[PDB]
Amino acid sequence: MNLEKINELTAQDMAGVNAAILEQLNSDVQLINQLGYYIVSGGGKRIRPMIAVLAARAVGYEGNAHVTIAALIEFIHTATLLHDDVVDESDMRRGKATANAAFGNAASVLVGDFIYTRAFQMMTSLGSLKVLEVMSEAVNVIAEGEVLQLMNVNDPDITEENYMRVIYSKTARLFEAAAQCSGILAGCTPEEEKGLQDYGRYLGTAFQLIDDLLDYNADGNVGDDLNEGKPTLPLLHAMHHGTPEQAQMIRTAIEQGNGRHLLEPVLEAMNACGSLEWTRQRAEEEADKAIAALQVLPDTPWREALIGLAHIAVQ
Amino acid sequence: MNLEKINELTAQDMAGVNAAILEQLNSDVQLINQLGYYIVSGGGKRIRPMIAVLAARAVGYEGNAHVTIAALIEFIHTATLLHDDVVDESFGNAASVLVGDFIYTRAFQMMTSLGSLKVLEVMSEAVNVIAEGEVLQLMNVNDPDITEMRVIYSKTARLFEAAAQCSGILAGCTPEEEKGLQDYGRYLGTAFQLIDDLLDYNVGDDLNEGKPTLPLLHAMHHGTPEQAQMIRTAIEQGNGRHLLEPVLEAMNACGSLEWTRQRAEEEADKAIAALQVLPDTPWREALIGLAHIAVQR
Ligand SMILES: CCCCCCCCCCCCCCOc1cccc(O)c1C(=O)O
């Protein structure tokens, strides 16, 4: 199932989601509504709400509480962007200016808090304490993960298995929760629930790995990870497999939290070791674990589209 | 029922509150840990959790989930101060944003662990209103206005209101009792913020930023024409830096501080009056005492 056909199957749910997002931008304070509109209409893929919508349909859900959770998921994600952009001091995202470049840091942080607290209101109104517990843990764990990276020294000598552990237990948890809570809301089976949960985790993992490799895929939002010496998978691979010169270069970049001027050198180092392809290969295995976790659910068009999203994510 | 007797009656409860704060705030990052220390060993009289703990007790609660409510309210407060410390071009922005995100999100985890949907409805609405209000205040430095009570309600009162109310709710209190606690928190919160506004002309940021607070507005409406003009243009300019002396002259000569404390006293009486719906206990006596203390600076 290609993107076009996934979009076609999902179109009416996704349009209910678009409506439900725009509905909740209803403050007296216009700055909230305009900054929120600014970011939500900017071309987002809305893959997290897409996964939620699909999962509920994949386990037979007939109502439209799933549109609601998809919308609030896109709100959580939106709030995490607005904060990421302020933290990472970014001026551009997706071709154009960021919320903080356009409106400033304070409004960015504060409209993000509004947006997060609204999603938590939307979630409460669905009346599942279980979903609230799962979702509110996933967000706190992501925020904890950000404070760790900030306040500490990146360990260049992290094991690969411990790197994946960070993704499984923290960075992908929104993807995990998007699928799982949708399942829980549809009264799904415990087997089905664990299936969607593992699919979300694995797809988000695959997605995180591809995003990281794509950050180095230049010549067409490229190079930011190496500029701040961020210890991602492809960069660490080149450090372990490159020449001790390349290694030591990539090492000082991670130790400084600064790899400015280093892009082309690291590209050549990566290209020699096959680091990008090897990351694309690690990602494929994640996509297959996601696809395999779904086999516990009925064979449906919605299941095909989830399987389709996983293949698409790993190009 | 003075401050020290209120502290001793609320002591065992506050020990649980303090432990829950340190429990939820031990991290592998030291900034977070030190924060917990500064909260529990903080300088102030922490009336927010004290109200949360007393509101429950005063409606028959014998459990210990009101300790979680107390803790999470103080988390909400703390995280909102952290996000206020974020600035634009002209403990950095990154750490204020992220540590405040960690704390706010943990507060939501703690709310939801109590297992009440009613509490979560109310607590999630109050925090949304607060966040909305911070953004209003932002729009207000960009376009000042000399109105009139809606800012302080969102900035301060709403969270006192939710703290009293949800504690009531969590003890399965009567709807009458819920309303009395809820109003008690709203009126005490309002009185608290009015007292705080008046104490700022005594560290002094409100005037530096040309913030239209109650004492400054009163002086603009009752002061001589020159004082009126001076104040109006500091508010609309967003800058009263160095004007303290002539503003204080204006406030003293037409009674702006005293009039503000009096209006705070009025709100505190209302808080007390909402509480007469509850049973007569030492817990209610202590709630009543907090309202008096809040409005004697
Ligand atoms: C009042 C409560 C407000 C709480 C706000 C909740 C959000 C937690 C705060 C941490 C934000 C971290 C962003 C997660 O990473 C991303 C996510 C998505 C896209 C991205 O590019 C990124 C990225 O790492 O660059």
Side-chain angles (χ1 to χ4, degrees), chain A residues 27 29 31-32 83 87 104-107 109-110 113-114 117-118 120-121 124 127 129 132 136-137 139-140 144 146-148 150-151, chain B residues 27 31-32 83 87-88 93 95 97-98 101-102 105-106 108-109 112 115 117 120-121 124-125 127-128 131-132 135-136 138-139:
Chain A
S27 181
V29 188
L31 180 50
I32 286 163
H83 293 188
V87 160
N105 282 329
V109 174
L110 299 186
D113 297 341
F114 181 87
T117 61
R118 174 58 47 91
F120 194 87
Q121 279 173 287
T124 301
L129 286 165
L132 284 152
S136 72
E137 206 188 291
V139 152
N140 176 272
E144 189 165 20
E146 296 298 338
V147 182
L148 255 224
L150 221 226
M151 243 40 193
Chain B
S27 223
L31 208 65
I32 289 173
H83 280 190
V87 300
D88 334 49
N93 288 358
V97 167
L98 297 174
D101 278 347
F102 170 80
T105 63
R106 179 54 59 80
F108 285 100
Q109 258 177 313
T112 130
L117 282 165
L120 281 164
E121 184 176 319
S124 73
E125 202 193 289
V127 184
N128 184 247
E132 183 186 52
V135 179
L136 178 83
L138 242 193
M139 230 165 107

Short mmCIF file of all heavy atoms in Angstrom, two decimals, chain A residues 27 29 31-32 83 87 104-107 109-110 113-114 117-118 120-121 124 127 129 132 136-137 139-140 144 146-148 150-151, chain B residues 27 31-32 83 87-88 93 95 97-98 101-102 105-106 108-109 112 115 117 120-121 124-125 127-128 131-132 135-136 138-139:
data_model
loop_
_atom_site.label_atom_id
_atom_site.label_comp_id
_atom_site.label_asym_id
_atom_site.label_seq_id
_atom_site.Cartn_x
_atom_site.Cartn_y
_atom_site.Cartn_z
N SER A 27 -9.27 30.19 22.09
CA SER A 27 -9.01 31.09 23.22
C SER A 27 -9.50 32.50 22.92
O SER A 27 -9.55 32.90 21.76
CB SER A 27 -7.53 31.14 23.53
OG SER A 27 -7.31 31.98 24.65
N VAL A 29 -7.51 34.81 23.95
CA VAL A 29 -6.18 35.33 23.65
C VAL A 29 -5.81 34.93 22.23
O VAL A 29 -5.56 33.76 21.98
CB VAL A 29 -5.17 34.77 24.67
CG1 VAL A 29 -3.81 35.44 24.54
CG2 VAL A 29 -5.70 34.93 26.09
N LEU A 31 -3.30 35.53 20.33
CA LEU A 31 -1.93 35.08 20.11
C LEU A 31 -1.79 33.58 20.21
O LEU A 31 -0.95 33.02 19.53
CB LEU A 31 -0.94 35.74 21.05
CG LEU A 31 0.53 35.32 20.88
CD1 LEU A 31 0.97 35.40 19.43
CD2 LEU A 31 1.45 36.17 21.74
N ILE A 32 -2.58 32.92 21.06
CA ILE A 32 -2.56 31.47 21.15
C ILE A 32 -3.06 30.89 19.86
O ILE A 32 -2.39 30.09 19.24
CB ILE A 32 -3.43 30.97 22.31
CG1 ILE A 32 -2.74 31.26 23.64
CG2 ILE A 32 -3.73 29.50 22.18
CD1 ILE A 32 -3.66 31.19 24.85
N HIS A 83 8.66 23.66 21.94
CA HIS A 83 9.72 23.64 22.93
C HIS A 83 11.08 23.23 22.37
O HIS A 83 12.06 23.90 22.68
CB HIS A 83 9.30 22.82 24.15
CG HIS A 83 8.19 23.48 24.92
ND1 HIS A 83 7.74 23.02 26.14
CD2 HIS A 83 7.47 24.59 24.65
CE1 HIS A 83 6.79 23.82 26.58
NE2 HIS A 83 6.59 24.78 25.69
N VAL A 87 14.57 25.39 22.65
CA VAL A 87 15.72 24.71 23.26
C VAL A 87 16.90 24.60 22.29
O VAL A 87 18.02 24.93 22.67
CB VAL A 87 15.33 23.27 23.73
CG1 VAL A 87 16.53 22.36 23.92
CG2 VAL A 87 14.50 23.34 25.01
N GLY A 104 8.77 34.92 18.87
CA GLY A 104 9.64 34.97 20.04
C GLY A 104 9.49 33.77 20.97
O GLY A 104 8.45 33.08 20.97
N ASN A 105 10.51 33.61 21.81
CA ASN A 105 10.67 32.49 22.71
C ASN A 105 9.54 32.38 23.74
O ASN A 105 9.03 31.30 23.98
CB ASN A 105 12.01 32.59 23.45
CG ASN A 105 13.20 32.17 22.59
OD1 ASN A 105 13.09 31.31 21.72
ND2 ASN A 105 14.35 32.72 22.90
N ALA A 106 9.17 33.47 24.38
CA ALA A 106 8.22 33.33 25.46
C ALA A 106 6.88 32.81 24.95
O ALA A 106 6.30 31.90 25.55
CB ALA A 106 8.04 34.64 26.20
N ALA A 107 6.38 33.37 23.86
CA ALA A 107 5.06 32.99 23.32
C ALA A 107 5.09 31.54 22.85
O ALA A 107 4.17 30.76 23.11
CB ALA A 107 4.67 33.92 22.17
N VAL A 109 6.96 29.15 24.18
CA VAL A 109 6.93 28.28 25.35
C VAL A 109 5.54 28.24 25.95
O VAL A 109 5.00 27.18 26.25
CB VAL A 109 7.92 28.75 26.43
CG1 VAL A 109 7.78 27.92 27.69
CG2 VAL A 109 9.36 28.67 25.91
N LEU A 110 4.93 29.41 26.04
CA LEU A 110 3.65 29.55 26.70
C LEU A 110 2.46 29.08 25.88
O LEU A 110 1.50 28.55 26.44
CB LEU A 110 3.46 31.00 27.13
CG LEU A 110 4.54 31.48 28.12
CD1 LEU A 110 4.20 32.88 28.62
CD2 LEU A 110 4.72 30.52 29.29
N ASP A 113 2.57 25.40 26.24
CA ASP A 113 1.98 24.95 27.51
C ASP A 113 0.46 24.93 27.41
O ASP A 113 -0.20 23.96 27.82
CB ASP A 113 2.37 25.85 28.67
CG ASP A 113 3.86 25.86 28.95
OD1 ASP A 113 4.56 24.91 28.50
OD2 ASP A 113 4.32 26.82 29.63
N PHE A 114 -0.12 26.00 26.87
CA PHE A 114 -1.56 25.99 26.56
C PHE A 114 -1.96 24.80 25.72
O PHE A 114 -2.92 24.10 26.01
CB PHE A 114 -1.99 27.23 25.79
CG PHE A 114 -3.45 27.26 25.49
CD1 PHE A 114 -4.34 27.77 26.39
CD2 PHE A 114 -3.92 26.76 24.30
CE1 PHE A 114 -5.68 27.79 26.12
CE2 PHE A 114 -5.26 26.73 24.04
CZ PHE A 114 -6.15 27.26 24.94
N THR A 117 -1.72 21.57 27.76
CA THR A 117 -2.76 21.43 28.77
C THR A 117 -4.13 21.21 28.14
O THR A 117 -4.97 20.52 28.73
CB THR A 117 -2.83 22.64 29.71
OG1 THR A 117 -3.14 23.81 28.96
CG2 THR A 117 -1.54 22.86 30.45
N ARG A 118 -4.35 21.77 26.96
CA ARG A 118 -5.60 21.51 26.23
C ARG A 118 -5.73 20.04 25.81
O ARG A 118 -6.79 19.43 25.96
CB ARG A 118 -5.75 22.44 25.01
CG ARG A 118 -6.96 22.13 24.11
CD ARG A 118 -8.31 22.16 24.81
NE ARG A 118 -8.47 23.36 25.66
CZ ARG A 118 -8.99 24.55 25.29
NH1 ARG A 118 -9.50 24.75 24.08
NH2 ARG A 118 -9.03 25.54 26.17
N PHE A 120 -4.44 17.55 27.29
CA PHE A 120 -4.76 16.82 28.49
C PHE A 120 -6.23 16.96 28.93
O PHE A 120 -6.81 16.06 29.55
CB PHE A 120 -3.79 17.23 29.59
CG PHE A 120 -3.81 16.33 30.75
CD1 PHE A 120 -3.02 15.19 30.76
CD2 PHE A 120 -4.75 16.54 31.76
CE1 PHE A 120 -3.09 14.31 31.82
CE2 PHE A 120 -4.84 15.64 32.82
CZ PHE A 120 -3.99 14.54 32.87
N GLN A 121 -6.84 18.08 28.61
CA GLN A 121 -8.28 18.23 28.76
C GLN A 121 -9.06 17.39 27.79
O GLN A 121 -10.12 16.86 28.12
CB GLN A 121 -8.71 19.64 28.53
CG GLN A 121 -8.50 20.55 29.70
CD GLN A 121 -8.80 21.95 29.29
OE1 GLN A 121 -8.03 22.57 28.58
NE2 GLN A 121 -9.98 22.43 29.65
N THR A 124 -8.78 13.72 29.06
CA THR A 124 -9.59 13.50 30.23
C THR A 124 -11.02 13.31 29.80
O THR A 124 -11.75 12.48 30.36
CB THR A 124 -9.54 14.71 31.21
OG1 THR A 124 -8.20 14.95 31.62
CG2 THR A 124 -10.36 14.43 32.46
N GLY A 127 -12.35 9.85 29.16
CA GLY A 127 -12.84 9.07 30.31
C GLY A 127 -12.11 7.78 30.57
O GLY A 127 -12.57 6.94 31.36
N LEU A 129 -8.86 6.47 32.27
CA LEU A 129 -7.71 6.70 33.13
C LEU A 129 -6.46 5.98 32.66
O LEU A 129 -5.35 6.45 32.86
CB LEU A 129 -8.02 6.24 34.54
CG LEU A 129 -8.95 7.16 35.33
CD1 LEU A 129 -9.47 6.41 36.57
CD2 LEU A 129 -8.24 8.46 35.72
N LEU A 132 -4.85 8.03 30.01
CA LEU A 132 -4.20 9.16 30.67
C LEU A 132 -2.90 8.74 31.31
O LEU A 132 -1.94 9.49 31.29
CB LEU A 132 -5.09 9.76 31.73
CG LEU A 132 -6.20 10.62 31.16
CD1 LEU A 132 -7.39 10.59 32.13
CD2 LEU A 132 -5.73 12.03 30.84
N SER A 136 0.41 10.18 29.69
CA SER A 136 1.10 11.14 30.54
C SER A 136 2.46 10.61 31.02
O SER A 136 3.38 11.39 31.19
CB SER A 136 0.21 11.71 31.65
OG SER A 136 -0.03 10.73 32.63
N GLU A 137 2.66 9.30 31.06
CA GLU A 137 3.99 8.74 31.32
C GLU A 137 4.91 8.97 30.12
O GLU A 137 6.05 9.39 30.30
CB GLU A 137 3.95 7.24 31.65
CG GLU A 137 5.12 6.79 32.52
CD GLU A 137 5.22 5.29 32.70
OE1 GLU A 137 4.34 4.72 33.39
OE2 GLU A 137 6.19 4.70 32.16
N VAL A 139 4.99 11.23 27.92
CA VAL A 139 5.39 12.60 27.68
C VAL A 139 6.41 13.03 28.73
O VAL A 139 7.34 13.81 28.46
CB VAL A 139 4.14 13.51 27.63
CG1 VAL A 139 4.44 14.92 28.06
CG2 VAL A 139 3.58 13.52 26.23
N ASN A 140 6.19 12.56 29.95
CA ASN A 140 7.10 12.89 31.01
C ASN A 140 8.45 12.24 30.78
O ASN A 140 9.48 12.84 31.02
CB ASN A 140 6.56 12.47 32.36
CG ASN A 140 7.55 12.73 33.45
OD1 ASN A 140 8.38 11.87 33.72
ND2 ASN A 140 7.59 13.97 33.97
N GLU A 144 11.92 14.16 30.46
CA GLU A 144 13.06 13.73 31.25
C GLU A 144 14.25 13.49 30.36
O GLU A 144 15.33 13.93 30.68
CB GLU A 144 12.81 12.45 32.03
CG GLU A 144 13.96 12.20 32.99
CD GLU A 144 13.66 11.18 34.05
OE1 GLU A 144 12.73 10.36 33.88
OE2 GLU A 144 14.41 11.19 35.05
N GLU A 146 15.04 14.85 27.56
CA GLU A 146 15.61 16.12 27.11
C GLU A 146 16.44 16.81 28.17
O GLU A 146 17.43 17.42 27.85
CB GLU A 146 14.52 17.11 26.70
CG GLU A 146 13.69 16.68 25.50
CD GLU A 146 14.50 16.51 24.24
OE1 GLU A 146 15.59 17.09 24.14
OE2 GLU A 146 14.06 15.76 23.35
N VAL A 147 16.01 16.73 29.41
CA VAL A 147 16.73 17.35 30.50
C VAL A 147 18.06 16.63 30.71
O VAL A 147 19.07 17.26 30.91
CB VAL A 147 15.88 17.36 31.78
CG1 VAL A 147 16.60 18.06 32.92
CG2 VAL A 147 14.59 18.12 31.52
N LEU A 148 18.07 15.30 30.62
CA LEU A 148 19.31 14.51 30.64
C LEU A 148 20.34 14.93 29.60
O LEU A 148 21.50 15.10 29.93
CB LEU A 148 19.04 13.01 30.41
CG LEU A 148 19.09 12.01 31.55
CD1 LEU A 148 19.83 10.76 31.10
CD2 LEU A 148 19.76 12.56 32.79
N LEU A 150 20.58 17.72 27.90
CA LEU A 150 20.96 19.09 28.20
C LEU A 150 21.99 19.17 29.31
O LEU A 150 23.07 19.74 29.15
CB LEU A 150 19.72 19.88 28.64
CG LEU A 150 19.48 21.31 28.17
CD1 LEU A 150 19.08 22.18 29.36
CD2 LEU A 150 20.65 21.92 27.40
N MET A 151 21.67 18.57 30.45
CA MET A 151 22.42 18.81 31.66
C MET A 151 23.63 17.93 31.78
O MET A 151 24.46 18.15 32.65
CB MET A 151 21.54 18.64 32.90
CG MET A 151 21.41 19.94 33.68
SD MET A 151 21.24 21.35 32.56
CE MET A 151 21.51 22.72 33.69
N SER B 27 16.32 12.86 40.45
CA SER B 27 16.68 12.58 39.08
C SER B 27 18.14 12.20 39.06
O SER B 27 18.76 12.06 40.11
CB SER B 27 16.38 13.78 38.19
OG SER B 27 15.78 13.35 36.98
N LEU B 31 20.19 19.39 38.80
CA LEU B 31 19.36 20.59 38.81
C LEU B 31 17.96 20.30 39.33
O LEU B 31 17.42 21.04 40.15
CB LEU B 31 19.27 21.18 37.40
CG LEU B 31 19.05 22.69 37.38
CD1 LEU B 31 20.24 23.45 37.98
CD2 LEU B 31 18.81 23.12 35.95
N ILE B 32 17.40 19.20 38.86
CA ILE B 32 16.13 18.73 39.32
C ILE B 32 16.13 18.43 40.84
O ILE B 32 15.24 18.89 41.55
CB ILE B 32 15.71 17.52 38.49
CG1 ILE B 32 15.34 17.99 37.08
CG2 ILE B 32 14.56 16.76 39.15
CD1 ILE B 32 15.06 16.86 36.09
N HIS B 83 8.75 28.63 33.56
CA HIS B 83 8.45 29.06 32.21
C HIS B 83 8.36 30.56 32.08
O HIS B 83 8.66 31.08 31.03
CB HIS B 83 7.21 28.38 31.67
CG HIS B 83 7.48 26.99 31.18
ND1 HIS B 83 6.56 26.26 30.47
CD2 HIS B 83 8.58 26.21 31.30
CE1 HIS B 83 7.07 25.07 30.21
NE2 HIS B 83 8.30 25.02 30.69
N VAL B 87 13.09 34.19 28.38
CA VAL B 87 13.17 35.50 27.73
C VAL B 87 13.53 35.33 26.25
O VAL B 87 13.96 34.25 25.82
CB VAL B 87 14.20 36.43 28.41
CG1 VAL B 87 13.81 36.65 29.86
CG2 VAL B 87 15.62 35.87 28.29
N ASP B 88 13.39 36.41 25.51
CA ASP B 88 13.68 36.44 24.07
C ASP B 88 14.94 37.26 23.88
O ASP B 88 15.67 37.53 24.84
CB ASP B 88 12.49 37.05 23.34
CG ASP B 88 11.20 36.88 24.11
OD1 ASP B 88 11.21 37.21 25.32
OD2 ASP B 88 10.21 36.38 23.53
N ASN B 93 17.38 29.59 29.20
CA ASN B 93 16.04 29.33 28.62
C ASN B 93 15.83 27.83 28.47
O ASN B 93 14.77 27.30 28.79
CB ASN B 93 15.86 29.97 27.24
CG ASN B 93 15.71 31.47 27.29
OD1 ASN B 93 15.70 32.09 28.35
ND2 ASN B 93 15.59 32.07 26.12
N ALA B 95 17.09 25.24 30.16
CA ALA B 95 16.84 24.54 31.42
C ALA B 95 15.49 24.96 32.06
O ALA B 95 14.79 24.11 32.59
CB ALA B 95 18.00 24.73 32.40
N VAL B 97 12.83 25.89 30.39
CA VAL B 97 11.80 25.27 29.54
C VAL B 97 11.70 23.78 29.82
O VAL B 97 10.60 23.27 30.03
CB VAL B 97 12.08 25.50 28.03
CG1 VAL B 97 11.20 24.61 27.17
CG2 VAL B 97 11.83 26.95 27.66
N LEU B 98 12.84 23.10 29.80
CA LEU B 98 12.88 21.64 29.97
C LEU B 98 12.63 21.17 31.39
O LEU B 98 11.95 20.17 31.55
CB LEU B 98 14.18 21.03 29.44
CG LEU B 98 14.38 21.23 27.93
CD1 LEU B 98 15.76 20.74 27.51
CD2 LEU B 98 13.29 20.54 27.13
N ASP B 101 9.11 21.66 31.94
CA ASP B 101 8.34 20.66 31.21
C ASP B 101 8.32 19.35 31.99
O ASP B 101 7.29 18.69 32.04
CB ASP B 101 8.92 20.40 29.81
CG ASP B 101 8.48 21.44 28.77
OD1 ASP B 101 7.54 22.24 29.01
OD2 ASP B 101 9.10 21.45 27.69
N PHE B 102 9.46 18.96 32.56
CA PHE B 102 9.55 17.72 33.34
C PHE B 102 8.58 17.78 34.51
O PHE B 102 7.83 16.84 34.72
CB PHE B 102 10.95 17.49 33.90
CG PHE B 102 11.02 16.37 34.91
CD1 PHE B 102 11.06 15.03 34.49
CD2 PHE B 102 11.05 16.63 36.28
CE1 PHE B 102 11.14 13.99 35.41
CE2 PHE B 102 11.10 15.61 37.19
CZ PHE B 102 11.15 14.28 36.76
N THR B 105 4.74 17.94 33.50
CA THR B 105 4.30 16.60 33.04
C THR B 105 4.21 15.60 34.20
O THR B 105 3.36 14.71 34.19
CB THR B 105 5.19 15.99 31.89
OG1 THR B 105 6.55 15.77 32.33
CG2 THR B 105 5.21 16.87 30.62
N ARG B 106 5.10 15.71 35.18
CA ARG B 106 5.03 14.85 36.34
C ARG B 106 3.77 15.17 37.18
O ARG B 106 3.08 14.27 37.64
CB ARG B 106 6.30 14.98 37.16
CG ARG B 106 6.35 14.15 38.43
CD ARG B 106 6.08 12.66 38.21
NE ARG B 106 7.02 12.04 37.26
CZ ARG B 106 8.26 11.64 37.57
NH1 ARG B 106 8.77 11.82 38.79
NH2 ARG B 106 9.01 11.11 36.62
N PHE B 108 0.98 16.10 35.96
CA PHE B 108 -0.13 15.43 35.24
C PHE B 108 -0.17 13.94 35.50
O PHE B 108 -1.21 13.36 35.67
CB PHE B 108 -0.15 15.77 33.74
CG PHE B 108 -0.65 17.16 33.45
CD1 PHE B 108 0.24 18.19 33.18
CD2 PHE B 108 -2.00 17.45 33.50
CE1 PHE B 108 -0.20 19.47 32.96
CE2 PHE B 108 -2.45 18.73 33.27
CZ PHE B 108 -1.55 19.74 33.00
N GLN B 109 0.99 13.33 35.59
CA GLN B 109 1.09 11.94 36.03
C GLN B 109 0.51 11.76 37.43
O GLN B 109 -0.25 10.83 37.68
CB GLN B 109 2.57 11.56 36.05
CG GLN B 109 3.05 10.74 34.89
CD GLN B 109 4.54 10.47 34.96
OE1 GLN B 109 5.32 11.38 35.22
NE2 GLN B 109 4.95 9.26 34.65
N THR B 112 -3.29 12.14 37.63
CA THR B 112 -3.98 10.98 37.08
C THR B 112 -3.83 9.74 37.94
O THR B 112 -4.73 8.94 37.94
CB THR B 112 -3.84 10.69 35.56
OG1 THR B 112 -3.47 9.33 35.32
CG2 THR B 112 -2.92 11.60 34.83
N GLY B 115 -6.71 8.74 40.36
CA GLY B 115 -7.80 7.95 39.81
C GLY B 115 -9.16 8.61 39.85
O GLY B 115 -10.16 7.92 39.83
N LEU B 117 -11.72 11.14 37.76
CA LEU B 117 -11.87 11.82 36.46
C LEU B 117 -12.35 13.22 36.71
O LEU B 117 -11.98 14.15 36.00
CB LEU B 117 -12.84 11.07 35.53
CG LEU B 117 -12.28 9.82 34.82
CD1 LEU B 117 -13.39 8.96 34.23
CD2 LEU B 117 -11.29 10.20 33.73
N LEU B 120 -9.40 15.33 37.60
CA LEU B 120 -8.64 15.59 36.39
C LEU B 120 -9.32 16.61 35.49
O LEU B 120 -8.66 17.45 34.90
CB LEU B 120 -8.41 14.31 35.60
CG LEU B 120 -7.30 13.43 36.11
CD1 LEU B 120 -7.38 12.04 35.53
CD2 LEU B 120 -5.99 14.03 35.72
N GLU B 121 -10.64 16.54 35.38
CA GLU B 121 -11.40 17.54 34.63
C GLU B 121 -11.10 18.95 35.15
O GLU B 121 -10.52 19.75 34.44
CB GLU B 121 -12.89 17.22 34.71
CG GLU B 121 -13.78 18.15 33.90
CD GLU B 121 -15.23 17.74 33.94
OE1 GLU B 121 -15.51 16.52 33.87
OE2 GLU B 121 -16.09 18.65 34.04
N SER B 124 -7.21 19.87 35.19
CA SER B 124 -6.72 20.11 33.83
C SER B 124 -7.28 21.41 33.26
O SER B 124 -6.61 22.09 32.49
CB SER B 124 -7.01 18.93 32.88
OG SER B 124 -8.40 18.83 32.52
N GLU B 125 -8.51 21.76 33.62
CA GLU B 125 -9.04 23.06 33.23
C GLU B 125 -8.31 24.25 33.88
O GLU B 125 -8.09 25.28 33.24
CB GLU B 125 -10.53 23.18 33.52
CG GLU B 125 -11.15 24.25 32.64
CD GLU B 125 -12.54 24.66 33.06
OE1 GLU B 125 -13.48 23.86 32.88
OE2 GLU B 125 -12.70 25.81 33.51
N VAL B 127 -5.19 24.45 35.02
CA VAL B 127 -3.87 24.61 34.46
C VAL B 127 -3.92 25.21 33.05
O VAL B 127 -3.00 25.95 32.68
CB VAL B 127 -3.06 23.31 34.49
CG1 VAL B 127 -1.66 23.54 33.98
CG2 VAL B 127 -2.93 22.83 35.92
N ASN B 128 -4.98 24.92 32.29
CA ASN B 128 -5.15 25.47 30.94
C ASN B 128 -5.42 26.95 30.98
O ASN B 128 -4.84 27.71 30.23
CB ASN B 128 -6.31 24.79 30.20
CG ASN B 128 -6.46 25.28 28.76
OD1 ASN B 128 -7.43 25.93 28.42
ND2 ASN B 128 -5.47 25.01 27.93
N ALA B 131 -2.23 28.76 31.89
CA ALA B 131 -1.34 28.87 30.76
C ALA B 131 -1.88 29.91 29.80
O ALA B 131 -1.12 30.67 29.19
CB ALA B 131 -1.21 27.53 30.09
N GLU B 132 -3.19 29.94 29.65
CA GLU B 132 -3.81 30.93 28.79
C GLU B 132 -3.47 32.34 29.31
O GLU B 132 -3.08 33.25 28.54
CB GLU B 132 -5.33 30.70 28.73
CG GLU B 132 -6.06 31.64 27.80
CD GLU B 132 -7.56 31.46 27.89
OE1 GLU B 132 -8.08 31.51 29.02
OE2 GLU B 132 -8.22 31.28 26.84
N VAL B 135 -0.16 33.83 28.60
CA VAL B 135 -0.03 34.30 27.24
C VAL B 135 -0.79 35.62 27.11
O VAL B 135 -0.31 36.51 26.41
CB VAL B 135 -0.55 33.29 26.20
CG1 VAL B 135 -0.39 33.86 24.79
CG2 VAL B 135 0.20 31.97 26.28
N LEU B 136 -1.94 35.75 27.77
CA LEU B 136 -2.61 37.07 27.88
C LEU B 136 -1.64 38.17 28.34
O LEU B 136 -1.53 39.20 27.71
CB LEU B 136 -3.82 37.00 28.83
CG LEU B 136 -4.63 38.28 29.13
CD1 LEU B 136 -5.66 38.52 28.04
CD2 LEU B 136 -5.35 38.19 30.47
N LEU B 138 1.50 38.29 28.18
CA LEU B 138 2.42 38.55 27.09
C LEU B 138 1.87 39.53 26.04
O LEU B 138 2.57 40.39 25.56
CB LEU B 138 2.78 37.22 26.42
CG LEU B 138 4.25 36.86 26.49
CD1 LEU B 138 4.47 35.72 25.52
CD2 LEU B 138 5.10 38.08 26.12
N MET B 139 0.62 39.32 25.66
CA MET B 139 -0.13 40.20 24.77
C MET B 139 -0.28 41.56 25.45
O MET B 139 -0.24 42.60 24.78
CB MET B 139 -1.51 39.59 24.48
CG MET B 139 -1.89 39.51 23.01
SD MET B 139 -3.30 38.40 22.73
CE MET B 139 -4.64 39.54 22.36
#
